[model samples]
Target: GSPEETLVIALYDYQTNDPQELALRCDEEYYLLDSSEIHWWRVQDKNGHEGYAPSSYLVEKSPN
Candidate 1:
């Protein structure tokens, strides 16, 4: 089955050494693959990389 999908924009550049997490670039667009977690949101970058990022750092996305 298809999972819920959404787009989000990174409001700030976020980076961390954790391999399971995603480092975000300010203003970059990414797919909000899963937002079931309250503090972390799973995302995939434009290049199709998947990782989790802070949910508070993202906002509704616009065209890239």
Candidate 2:
């Protein structure tokens, strides 16, 4: 199965105490691995970095 599509739209050096948390940057793209969590969405970055990021930080990508 393929991951869901999403994009990092707005961010500024986000970090977390959790080592597994995904650090995000503006305009970076990611694949939504899991959205079952309430606040964080498990995602894999372009470079294959898998971690959790705030769901609000990601935007749904258009199919264009």
Candidate 3:
């Protein structure tokens, strides 16, 4: 299947206890899948892990 679009860049590493959380690292890019409340976003890592992340921990990237 085609790759999903890149949505945001990780600002710092994060670990989560939620079985559905996506582990993130600084400089890594995540593909957006969905979102929840104002402060959280659903994303998938390159390794195919999908889960929620704090929106504050991500930086929006240019569409270019």
lDDT of 3 at 33: 67
User: lDDT at 26 for candidate 1?
Assistant: 90
Per-prediction TM-score to the true structure, in the order listed: 0.77, 0.64, 0.74
Clashing pairs in 3: none
**Where does candidate 3 stray beyond 4 Å?**
1-6, 35-39
**What TM-score does candidate 2 get on C-alpha atoms?**
0.64
Which candidate order results from sorting by TM-score in descending order? Answer: 1, 3, 2
Question: How displaced is residue 23 in candidate 3, in Å?
Answer: 0.3
> Which tens-of-lDDT digit does each residue in 1-64 have in candidate 2?
2245544443455766776998777776677766556767787877878888877766766445
Candidate 1 deviant stretches above 4 angstroms: 1-3, 62-64
lDDT (CA) per prediction: 0.79, 0.67, 0.77
Judged by lDDT against the true structure, how good is candidate 2?
0.67
Candidate 3 per-residue C-alpha lDDT over 1-64 given as tens digits, one digit per residue, 9 for 90 to 100: 2244447888998888886788888888888865435756888877878898888888766356
Candidate 1, residue 64: lDDT: 46
lDDT for 31 (candidate 1): 88
